[PDB]
A paper describes a structure:
Cyclodipeptide synthases (CDPS) are a family of [name] dependant enzymes that synthesise cyclic dipeptides using two aminoacylated [name] (aa-[name]) as substrates. Here, we investigated a CDPS from [name] ([name]), a cLL-synthesising enzyme that utilises Leu-tRNALeu as a substrate, and is predicted to be part of the biosynthetic machinery involved in pulcherrimin biosynthesis. The aminoacyl moiety of [name] is transferred onto the conserved active site serine residue (S33 in [name]), forming an aminoacyl-enzyme intermediate.
The crystal structure of full-length (residues 1–232) and S33A mutant enzymes was solved at a resolution of 1.69 Å and 1.78 Å, respectively (ESI†). [name] has a single domain with an αβ fold similar to other CDPS. The structure of CDPS is highly similar to [name]-BLIC (RMSD 0.88 Å, over 212 residues), AlbC (RMSD 2.25, over 212 residues) and Rv2275 (RMSD 2.00 Å, over 199 residues). Binding is facilitated by a hydrogen bond contact with the side chain carboxyl group of the catalytic Glu179 residue and other non-bonding contacts with P1 pocket residues. The aliphatic chain of 1,2-hexanediol molecule is projected deep into the P1 pocket, which is lined with mainly hydrophobic residues (L29, G31, L61, A63, F112, Phe182, F183, L197), ideal to accommodate a leucine substrate. However, the P2 pocket is far shallower and more solvent exposed. The P2 pocket is lined with a mixture of residues (R201, W203, K204, D148, S152, A149, R153), which is in keeping with the previously reported sequence homology that suggests the P2 pocket has conserved Met, Trp and Ala residues. The side chain of R153 is projected into the active site and makes a strong hydrogen-bond (distance = 2.6 Å) with the hydroxyl side chain of the catalytic serine residue, which is unknown for this class of enzymes.
Numbering used by the authors: 2 to 231
Write the structure that this text describes.
C-alpha cells in the first residue's frame, strides 16, 4: 500500500543528509521517552514507512540517563528508574510488533548498549571534551537539555516549574549520552551510512553543518525530519 510509502515527507538537515537518505541504506528511528507523540500507532507508522523505504531499519530507545530527565523535574531516583524501565519496555513491545509484522529483524537498542563499542566511546569522549572546553558547544548542549526538560514539564503537566541550571546540568547527561548517535550512528552500528530520523528539527545539527564546532557529523551520517502532510 502506497499510503504507507508516502506516510512521511522528509526534510533533510543538509544536502549530504539528502544524499544518504536517497541511498536508502539505513534509517535509525529515534524514539523519545516520556513523549506522547510515540503512541503504538505512531511507532507502527514509523516502522511501516521505514520498512517500505529502507534496506535496513534500526530503532533507538533511551538509555540509563533517561532517569535524569525525571530526576530534574522532581522525581526521586527510585520512582524515576521505575518509570524508565516501564517506558522502555513499552517502546520495545510496540517496536517489536511492527518490525515482526514487516518481516524485519528485531534491531532495537538503547543508547546505553554501546559501552564496549569503540566508536560510541570515542565520539562520547569528544562530546564531553568539547562540552567542557568549548563554551559555545556547551551552550548548545544545555539548550538541548532545556528543550528536553521544557517539553516534558508540559507533558508531565509541570509547566509551573522554573528550569534551573542544576536541572539543566543534570538532564544534559542525557543529551551527551545520545549525541554520539546523531554524530556517528551509522559507524557505531556498522552500516555504510545512515540517517537518524525524528519529527523535530535539530538546531545544534544546523550549527554543526554550518561548521561552527570542532565536533562534526561523520561523512556517512545524516539527519532527517519526518513530517506528516495531507
Ligand atoms: C533515544 C534518544 C532519542 C533520540 C531522538 O532523536 C530524540 O532525541
Amino acid at each position: 500500500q502506497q499510503v504507507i510509502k508516502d506516510l512521511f515527507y522528509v526534510v533533510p538537515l543538509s544536502r549530504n543528509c539528502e544524499k544518504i537518505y536517497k541511498n536508502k541504506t539505513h534509517i535509525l528511528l529515534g524514539i523519545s521517552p516520556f513523549n506522547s507523540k510515540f503512541s503504538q500507532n505512531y511507532i507502527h507508522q514509523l516502522i511501516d514507512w521505514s520498512s517500505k523505504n529502507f534496506k535496513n531499519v534500526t530503532v533507538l530507545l533511551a538509555g540509563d540517563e533517561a532517569k535524569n530527565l525525571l530526576e530534574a523535574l522532581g522525581t526521586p531516583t527510585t520512582k524515576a528508574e521505575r518509570k524508565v524501565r516501564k517506558e522502555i519496555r513499552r517502546h520495545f513491545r510496540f517496536s517489536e510488533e511492527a518490525l515482526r509484522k514487516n518481516g524485519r529483524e528485531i534491531d532495537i537498542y538503547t543508547f546505553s548498549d554501546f559501552k564496549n563499542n569503540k566508536i560510541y566511546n570515542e565520539v562520547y569522549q569528544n562530546v564531553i571534551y568539547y562540552f567542557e572546553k568549548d563554551e559555545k558547544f556547551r551552550k548548545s548542549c544545555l539548550a538541548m537539555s532545556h528543550d528536553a526538560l521544557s517539553s516534558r514539564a508540559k507533558s508531565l503537566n509541570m509547566e509551573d516549574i522554573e528550569i534551573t541550571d542544576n536541572m539543566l546540568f543534570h538532564a544534559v547527561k542525557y543529551v551527551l549520552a545520545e549525541l554520539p548517535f546523531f554524530l556517528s550512528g551509522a559507524s557505531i552500528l556498522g552500516y555504510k551510512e545512515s540517517v537518524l530520523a525524528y519529527h523535530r528539527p535539530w538546531k545544534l545539527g544546523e550549527k554543526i553543518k554550518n561548521s561552527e564546532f570542532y565536533i562534526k557529523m561523520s561523512d556517512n551520517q545524516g539527519y532527517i525530519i519526518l513530517k506528516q502532510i495531507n
